[PDB]
Amino acid sequence: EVILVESGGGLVQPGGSLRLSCSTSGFTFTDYYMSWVRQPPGKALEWLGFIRNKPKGYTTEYSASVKGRFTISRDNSQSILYLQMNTLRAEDSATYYCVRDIYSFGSRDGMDYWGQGTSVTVSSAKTTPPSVYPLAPGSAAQTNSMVTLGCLVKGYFPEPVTVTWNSGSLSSGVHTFPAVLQSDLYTLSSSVTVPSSTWPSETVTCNVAHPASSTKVDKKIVPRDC
Amino acid sequence: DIVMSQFPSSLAVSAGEKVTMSCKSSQSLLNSRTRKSYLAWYQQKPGQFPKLLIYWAATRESGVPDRFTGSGSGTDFTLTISSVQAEDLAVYYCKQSYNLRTFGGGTKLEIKRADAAPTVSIFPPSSEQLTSGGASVVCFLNNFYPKDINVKWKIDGSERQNGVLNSWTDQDSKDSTYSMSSTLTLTKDEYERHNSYTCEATHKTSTSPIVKSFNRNEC
Ligand SMILES: [Mg+2]
Ligand SMILES: [Mg+2]
Numbered sequence: 001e002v003i004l005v006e007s008g009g010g011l012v013q014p015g016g017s018l019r020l021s022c023s024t025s026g027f028t029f030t031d032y033y034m035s036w037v038r039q040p041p042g043k044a045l046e047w048l049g050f051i052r053n054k055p056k057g058y059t060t061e062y063s064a065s066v067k068g069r070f071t072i073s074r075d076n077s078q079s080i081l082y083l084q085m086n087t088l089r090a091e092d093s094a095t096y097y098c099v100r101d102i103y104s105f106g107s108r109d110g111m112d113y114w115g116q117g118t119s120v121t122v123s124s125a126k127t128t129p130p131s132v133y134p135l136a137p138g139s140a141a142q143t144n145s146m147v148t149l150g151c152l153v154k155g156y157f158p159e160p161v162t163v164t165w166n167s168g169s170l171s172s173g174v175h176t177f178p179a180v181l182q183s184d185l186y187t188l189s190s191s192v193t194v195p196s197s198t199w200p201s202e203t204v205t206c207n208v209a210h211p212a213s214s215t216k217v218d219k220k221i222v223p224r225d226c
Numbered sequence: 227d228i229v230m231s232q233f234p235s236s237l238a239v240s241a242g243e244k245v246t247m248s249c250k251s252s253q254s255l256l257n258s259r260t261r262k263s264y265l266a267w268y269q270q271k272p273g274q275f276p277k278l279l280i281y282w283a284a285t286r287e288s289g290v291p292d293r294f295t296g297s298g299s300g301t302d303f304t305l306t307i308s309s310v311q312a313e314d315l316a317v318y319y320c321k322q323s324y325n326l327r328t329f330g331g332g333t334k335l336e337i338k339r340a341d342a343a344p345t346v347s348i349f350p351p352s353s354e355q356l357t358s359g360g361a362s363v364v365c366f367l368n369n370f371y372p373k374d375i376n377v378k379w380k381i382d383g384s385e386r387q388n389g390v391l392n393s394w395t396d397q398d399s400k401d402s403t404y405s406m407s408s409t410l411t412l413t414k415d416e417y418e419r420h421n422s423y424t425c426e427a428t429h430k431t432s433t434s435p436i437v438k439s440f441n442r443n444e445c
Contacts, residue, residue, distance in 0.1 A: 035327065037329075044319065044329060044330075044331045044332050045268075045270075045276065045319055045321075045329045045332070046329065047321070047326070047327040047328060047329055049326075050326075050327070061326050063227070063326070063328075064227055097275065102323075108281065108282075108285075109264060109266065109281040109282055109323055110266045110278040110281035110287065110323075111268075111276075111278060112278050112287065114275040114276055114277075115275065116275055117275060131355070131358070133351075133352040133354050133355045133362075134352055134354070135349040135352075135364055136349070137347070138350070138440065138445075139440070139444075140347075148345065148347045148366060148368065150347075150349065150364070150366065152349075152352070152355075152362060152364060152409075154355075154360075154362065175368075175395050175398065175405055176395075177393045177394075177395055177405070177406070177407045178393050178394070178395065179393075180391050180393055182391070187391070187409070188393070189364060189366075189407050189409070191366050191368060191405065191407075193368070224445070226444060226445035
């Protein structure tokens with residue numbers, strides 16, 4: 001299958017530099033134009049530029065917003081695409097996508113494959129690991145078909161963090177709220193709803209991962225006793 | 227640069243109904259040699275990467291349901307969805323490829339459903355958090371509709387507003403509801419000089435709020 005995987009994202013100082021990578025497999029890399037597209041948290045997609053295919057000499061083009069500041073290149077031996085960013089600023093904070101563009105002008109068009117994206121934050125605020133607290137039912141744990149539990153993920157920087165339940169096995173009935181920033185620190189909570197017959201009979205644990213600080217923590221939800 | 231405009235930028239419809247989205251370009255995207263307009267549509271569901279739906283203005287990408295149809299030429303284009311389904315919930319972007327590439331600002335599609343009351347849960351600060359000097363009281367207002375809703379905090383029966391942070395999730399693909407959290411953050415000392423904590427949810431489907439609370443002395 002066609003595979004596109006971005007890497008290299010992280011936290012960088014304003015005025016700093018960063019080079020993102022995109023590893024590909026599953027198709028003849030040299031036959032394709034490759035594009036980079038970014039997207040701030042909850043904003044629109046913005047095309048940044050591309051590098052053409054082999055018959056086109058691997059030449060490059062850029063959006064007026066980053067031309068002269070960003071540089072696209074590629075390693076045809078390893079089938080890897082790169083994006084070198086310079087003199088970074090707050091407006092450059094976003095999720096960056098690697099995308100397979102056209103291989104032929106006459107047969108078709110469109111960016112038919114997209115990676116999952118890699119996150120970038122430009123800030124001078126320091127990296128801080130989150131504290132994870134359990135949100136357990138107290139007087140609840142009664143009789144009413146379903147029960148809702150949660151995990152509070154507080155005081156971290158920068159975004160993002162990923163929250164799963166029971167290592168991913170528990171996926172339905174789960175939603176995580178958007179983080180809120182305050183004084184250089186983010187906070188969010190995750191909610192999970194399961195039938196009373198499954199908890200606390202069977203365990204429920206939230207798994208929290210914060211790559212920027214290389215942290216991965218677990219928090220088992222135990223019912224409150226009083 | 228060719229500027230792409232998508233207005234209206236937000237649309238709401240019930241499943242089974244027709245939907246048409248607009249995309250206009252500041253310059254023509256019609257190539258006089260090929261007699262095709264270089265415009266594409268992409269679908270981005272909540273939290274996922276985008277997916278190509280249509281290119282060359284009206285050509286459907288492989289694997290795309292016939293429910294989606296693209297049309298238009300020159301500077302005016304539209305994307306139509308025959309019969310909208312709950313799973314079509316997403317933000318749709320158009321993109322020109324006539325000269326380099328440029329995306330429009332997107333049109334967010336919302337699914338209309340029966341009004342629903344939220345399921346409310348309140349949580350006291352955890353013992354683990356207290357042992358640090360902080361006290362966060364959390365309230366979940368889950369799976370309701372419409373999106374608009376109000377939350378009111380009361381300490382010992384008195385309303386509190388300073389120190390409250392609210393956050394709404396995007397609409398859920400399955401069930402088409404929304405959810406939101408309300409978090410009241412105090413210091414441990416502040417938390418300990420009061421006893422009753424209450425979260426009140428007032429929705430567009432309530433003559434009386436949905437109330438949840440706890441007494442600190444009952445632990
Ligand atoms: Mg539109
Ligand atoms: Mg663009």
